[PDB]
Design an enzyme around this catalytic site. Sequence first.
Site, mmCIF file in Angstrom:
data_model
loop_
_atom_site.group_PDB
_atom_site.id
_atom_site.type_symbol
_atom_site.label_atom_id
_atom_site.label_comp_id
_atom_site.label_asym_id
_atom_site.label_seq_id
_atom_site.Cartn_x
_atom_site.Cartn_y
_atom_site.Cartn_z
ATOM 1 N N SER A 102 24.444 17.721 -16.263
ATOM 2 C CA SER A 102 24.986 19.013 -15.717
ATOM 3 C C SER A 102 25.805 18.602 -14.614
ATOM 4 C CB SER A 102 23.751 19.994 -15.378
ATOM 5 O OG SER A 102 23.022 20.077 -16.393
ATOM 6 N N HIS A 139 0.907 -0.958 -0.213
ATOM 7 C CA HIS A 139 -0.011 0.165 -0.123
ATOM 8 C C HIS A 139 0.849 1.205 -0.020
ATOM 9 C CE1 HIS A 139 -3.719 -2.104 1.435
ATOM 10 N NE2 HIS A 139 -2.813 -2.888 1.976
ATOM 11 N N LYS A 159 21.476 13.477 -10.076
ATOM 12 C CA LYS A 159 20.045 13.509 -10.890
ATOM 13 C C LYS A 159 20.272 12.524 -12.096
ATOM 14 C CE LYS A 159 16.776 17.027 -12.377
ATOM 15 N NZ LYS A 159 15.924 16.545 -11.558
ATOM 16 N N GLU A 200 11.081 4.832 -18.764
ATOM 17 C CA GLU A 200 9.869 5.762 -19.414
ATOM 18 C C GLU A 200 9.706 5.236 -20.922
ATOM 19 O OE1 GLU A 200 11.057 9.683 -17.069
ATOM 20 O OE2 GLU A 200 11.124 9.569 -19.071
#
Lengths: 457, 457, 457, 457
Positions: D315, D185, D321, D328
């Site tokens: 970058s 959950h 990141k 995707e």
Amino acid sequence: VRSEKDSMGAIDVPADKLWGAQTQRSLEHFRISTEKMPTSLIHALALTKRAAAKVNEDLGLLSEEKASAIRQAADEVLAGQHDDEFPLAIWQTGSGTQSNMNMNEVLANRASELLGGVRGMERKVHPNDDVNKSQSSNDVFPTAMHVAALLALRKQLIPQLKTLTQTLNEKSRAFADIVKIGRTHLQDATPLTLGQEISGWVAMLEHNLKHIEYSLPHVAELALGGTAVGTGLNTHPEYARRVADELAVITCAPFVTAPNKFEALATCDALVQAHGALKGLAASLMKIANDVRWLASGPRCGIGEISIPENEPGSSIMPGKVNPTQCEALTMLCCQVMGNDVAINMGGASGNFELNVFRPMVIHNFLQSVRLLADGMESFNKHCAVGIEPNRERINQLLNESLMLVTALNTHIGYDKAAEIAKKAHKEGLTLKAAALALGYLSEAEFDSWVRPEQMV
Amino acid sequence: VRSEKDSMGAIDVPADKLWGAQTQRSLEHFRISTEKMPTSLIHALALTKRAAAKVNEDLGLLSEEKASAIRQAADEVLAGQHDDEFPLAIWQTGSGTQSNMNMNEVLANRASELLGGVRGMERKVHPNDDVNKSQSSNDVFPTAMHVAALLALRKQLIPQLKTLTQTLNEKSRAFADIVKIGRTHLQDATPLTLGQEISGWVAMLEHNLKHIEYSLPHVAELALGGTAVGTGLNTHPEYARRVADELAVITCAPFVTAPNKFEALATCDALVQAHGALKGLAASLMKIANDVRWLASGPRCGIGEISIPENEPGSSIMPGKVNPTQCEALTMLCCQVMGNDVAINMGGASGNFELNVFRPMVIHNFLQSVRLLADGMESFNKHCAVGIEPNRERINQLLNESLMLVTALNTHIGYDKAAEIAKKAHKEGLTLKAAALALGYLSEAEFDSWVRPEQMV
Amino acid sequence: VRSEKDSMGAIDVPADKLWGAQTQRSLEHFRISTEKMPTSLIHALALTKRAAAKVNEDLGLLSEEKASAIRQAADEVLAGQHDDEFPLAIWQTGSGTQSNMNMNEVLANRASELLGGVRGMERKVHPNDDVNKSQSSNDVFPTAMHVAALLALRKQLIPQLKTLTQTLNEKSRAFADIVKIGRTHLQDATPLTLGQEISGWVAMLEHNLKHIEYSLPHVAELALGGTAVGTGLNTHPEYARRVADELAVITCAPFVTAPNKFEALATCDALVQAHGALKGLAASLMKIANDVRWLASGPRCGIGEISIPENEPGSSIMPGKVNPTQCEALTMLCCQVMGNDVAINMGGASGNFELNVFRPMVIHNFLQSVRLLADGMESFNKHCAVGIEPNRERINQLLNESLMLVTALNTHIGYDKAAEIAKKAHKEGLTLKAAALALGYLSEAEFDSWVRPEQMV
Amino acid sequence: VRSEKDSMGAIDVPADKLWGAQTQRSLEHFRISTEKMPTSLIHALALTKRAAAKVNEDLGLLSEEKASAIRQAADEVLAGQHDDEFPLAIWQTGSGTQSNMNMNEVLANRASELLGGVRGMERKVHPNDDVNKSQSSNDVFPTAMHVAALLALRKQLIPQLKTLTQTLNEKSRAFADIVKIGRTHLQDATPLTLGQEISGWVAMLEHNLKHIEYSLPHVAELALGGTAVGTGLNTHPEYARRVADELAVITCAPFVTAPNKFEALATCDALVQAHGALKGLAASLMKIANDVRWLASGPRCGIGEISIPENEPGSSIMPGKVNPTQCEALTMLCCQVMGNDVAINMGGASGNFELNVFRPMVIHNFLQSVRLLADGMESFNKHCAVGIEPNRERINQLLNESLMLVTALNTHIGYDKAAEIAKKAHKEGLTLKAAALALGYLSEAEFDSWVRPEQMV
């Protein structure tokens, strides 16, 4: 080749290409299937880069020559001379980051050549610094998506819809006096005219146009200006409104900046909704196309009430056999739109937090549906619709053989007498007249004056 | 009323009810729509609680009387006397936690009465402590889901499928000698027998049975034993295998414990796949049902090659008009299964980490599809299929009117002569014979000896 | 029992029932699954029969007492005292013929009792002759379908939508000053306020309302008056407009007669289109519900930026563990609407000639979607939305740990210095400040005055 | 140009093209969208023409040179040197008549050049007479469809699936000892190892392989031999079995002739069913891909339990990141397969009588799904899966911060003492140890010896 360079390093790029390093590198990481960005999306992306250049220049954010060259390079993409500079698959980063860079790189290398002349690392125009100025892959792709959709809707699908409607409206007018037997549950029913039936097809198309038009305002809202998460960090306060106005000026479409950039970036809602109207049109087109093929089935063992143009080569030994090819292409693509709708809904419901990363897939399906619908209706109209002709003798034959007209007798001879001839006729395999005459209830002349199909609508 | 109590406190519960506090409280938090758990799921949940009781007892984890009363209470649910004790909506907690407790509470209060006699807080059997012993809502619901599905498949849908197949196989056998004109693209085509066409419907149903059977092994795998996340924390090492064996003993189905409990808990894959075979059967049934209604259209202005039983009251003034009602119910429910498949796929793809919490929705759609399919085929068979009869005179009429038989003449008179009569016949509106005789190419006797539809298959 | 009689003969009907023979007979021919007509459809069907009675009376087509008793009997159905008089399954004749008769029979037997008192063959009111006067199953079911849908939309779903919007709009207003880190691609991104994010949820709901409202005009068009095939054979020229006006008078909804009855009977287009807007809302609700559950995940190993009300009983040993139950019910029903849309599209595209016979299935799915959506939003609002609270300390913690704020330093120390601390901090596992101080680029006081998240929006 | 000729007359064809008149004419009638036949279908169509040539020759139905040249011309198509000779859109005649002729014409003109040398009307090989010998568009397209599908399944998708499975199985093995907190959950739950979780992904992929393999036998059945309606009129009795054996000899796949040609021609059932297994795999892949991206979210404000390869340029100011780009692309294409399934189901359920004319659309969707799935898994494996690494320190951190381990204390200190520290810890924001020590219930040493996550599985 030509060694281009990005933050990860230098990479070899085909010398005769305008794209840079990032495009080249993505080309290796996303070798999935064969679907690429549609030409309309690419041109919408160019239009976006052009309007952005023009606004940046207006805000003294980009020099006259830098801006003028990017825009001039963009017009070349629009002129259709750079179709081969966009190799990226649809199946890339969900934000459409790659294709945004792909545009930035091609527009940088080319704008450079339009000034000094360096295609490559020593170029005069920077893809990120100049081409992608005051933007982000997050807000540029959604803008290109809406620009491509609205324009495809306004000048590609709607025109074809109105055209199909007019043809069918005229066919409806011309056959207004041709009475035929109706069919409910596929069983013979009360009669109606051919024009009345076709008027149903027309009413449907007019209704659909109406539904498609209500979905345009939402699609006309552009995300450009919200940058990364929608806050619009690091952009001129007037940038958003300005870029929207410029895009509207050049496309002649009612583009406006999205009142809520968070909704604009976090979702593909406008397209989920717009596609809802498109699957609606597909369900309508499927029925119309089905009615046509069934109405034209035969030549001997079907319904055969109307004939359609025979566009494919046949055989002399097969006279009258005409496959309803246009009806088959239209019904097939209608199934596709239904399928595309499910792909769109799943991607549209899968947004997370500040951004929806299912965008390349969503616009691929949406654009394909408009393309299929617009072209399908064009092909159907031209190669089928304008050629719809009634087989008047076949229609009369069926009308006179059916028992559905026995109702017209009741006003002279009660239900008892009427139902009597309909029972016998059906049992013996006689028409209403044939049976009525044998049962001596009336004469042929009286029958022919009482059963008037032109009066029971 | 009766004040029951849970970890959040005490709550008022209808005195004449067997459920406890948690069920009562969920009843207020999830007042969504009107869909409740299907009877088959509830009975599968009872069967699970019963087998769990029996195994716990075997492992000395539950006393003889405690276990015997829970099982005896379960049999009452199975006997169908507690249908009204499960008020919970389908739209609850994605793990099916509530319905698990709902079963625990009803089984506790009742098993208590089967011993001492206290329905309520002073009950002798604890829902969580005794009824839900060695389990979790996480692994109990998935088990009940698989038990309900496999059993519904094995004794509800497959039997009806085999029955429809046999009826159609016999109709196929009986009409093996009836030659009719084929239809491709809805146009008249080469002839085939009615039995051959129907044999296609049979081959389809046999293929489907085969596809449904391949999906059973995966559905036969039970999650019971993986507890919360699949590790099986706090359960007897033999518990998993033991509960599966017991369920198999009582249901007579091939249940086995899932080799990987993580896959069993994290996904609804077995059902996504099993439903894939069901939407396959729906596409097959839709075509068969469509063929029937079209073949029976009329009585005068359609195809009318076969007649079907008229089960709904008609009019004397409307002889021969028979709406294909069974075909309409079957086609409608086939669309439902297609829709249900999309709901199932979306929920099945939305699992996160250790557990899929879209379960109540998934089993609701799956169970409904089996119910619709099984009952639809039963109704279709009984009220339509067994009554399929050929309109032999109508079939001959169509056969003799078509131009498709002109091929049979070529072996006597070249393509030139053959195509000649087919051209004229079509133009003048004459049959092959009529036109052939007028063109003096052959006699009626020669025509009747050369064009033998029974020989062109 | 009680022997009722129809054109096929007499049949035994439960004495304590108000339905007649046709309903009883259909009850045996369509024993498929467990889905029956929804209460809202039944009441819409009663409203239709009532308005039809009133208009017939106005046109001197039905006596004062006959009309007054039917209407009075209808009001009883509306009062909810005849819910058990409609046993018919959804899976019946595609035109909804049975349920139309079911209403005619119950209304005839009851209106009879409201006059003389004969429930059965010696009744004073005839179902077909009086109750079904100036109508047909073909045009009555489509009318009931549109009446039920428009009303469910106008007073069941829209009110709940506006309510959810207002709650979320206020939560948005209250948390306008709470800055949090944004997330794109599920990665840490530029910050935004909690109110800004929630404002996105609000903008989405306002947009949806707009899309739902555009689909109402088409659904407000009623088919009543087109009779069997749409020609309106055997009905007072003023009947169509009159019945529509009456329905509008009593429901207070903008009902109008369909300008084209052929489109109205041949298709379910209005509902295909209206449901397009509903699946749009479901995709929006799914995202909002997903954001909530993820934002509330934890208590320790997730995101935990907000807390939601704990409505289900928990454990003392499990403090802070709160399953997002409302989010699970809403996401599950959103999948259902997506599935329902496919069922609706398939049925809507399957119309043939003069009538679409997939109607019972179409309205079953449509009505269920409105019910699920309206009730889901009500439950979500009440049991979750109004209780959304920010975990301010958790939100700050995350904000100060992220590297995304290093951008705010550039305006003081170049990219070189800024990227230096972000590199080290990331490598050593230090915050921006911690790393910045160690690299002696600035002081804690300067850091705390330069990195202001409240200024980067 | 070059004037080619068909039954409708002569038409201008590009001189540098190998296609004939019919292909040229269809090119004008079906200008819909941009989708053309996939290369795999074209090669499967060539393989079919080649095997047919070889069998015809064996039955003395085609001369040595005529047959040898057609086969030799076919091998050139297979060699990939005629990719540009097939301009036809997917949206053509539902039977795939055009593309069949397109192949007949290219193979005739080329086989002619391989003998004498006439490309055009004076060619030595006739498309219809020689190339299309003993066949029909009705039975040739379905054969090409099955040949293309089985081969794409056997050597394109299955290999990639097994490869993804092995990589994940090894990652599972390597991380078998890494204990992490489970999530049900989306809330913290009982712990499990990273290898156990990943083993779930593996079990899923093994199950899917199993489901895909069960659908192969039905797809391996070829229609070739049933001719127009399935009766097999005008073909050597041994033709059907012979062509199937030859295709099996050259492809090394288990092709067999369809036992029922009527089912083979009237439906696309084998593909509807086969695609059911593919949407099943897509739902599995979607969950696996989702788990990965969420598990890798961060670097600071997400879950961050694992790290994945950074393939796209980033970058310096943005260390850590990494957008989950492969995840995707895979999730996006999984939505596509779901959508494609609906298109396939609608077309598969729309067959009428003797032939299904939705074929070009069905194979377009099916082939695209295999292509997307196979390539997606290849890209995911190579650019993501093999690079999955655990952030061990982050995983420990989360494990020690959660309250889920308080269960391990009960065996020493009752529920009362255990629940006490979990309550305080949660309230004060302390860990289990921190709170336990403050409440003086035990020492750090005892805590560290009692709470062993490696023992609670």
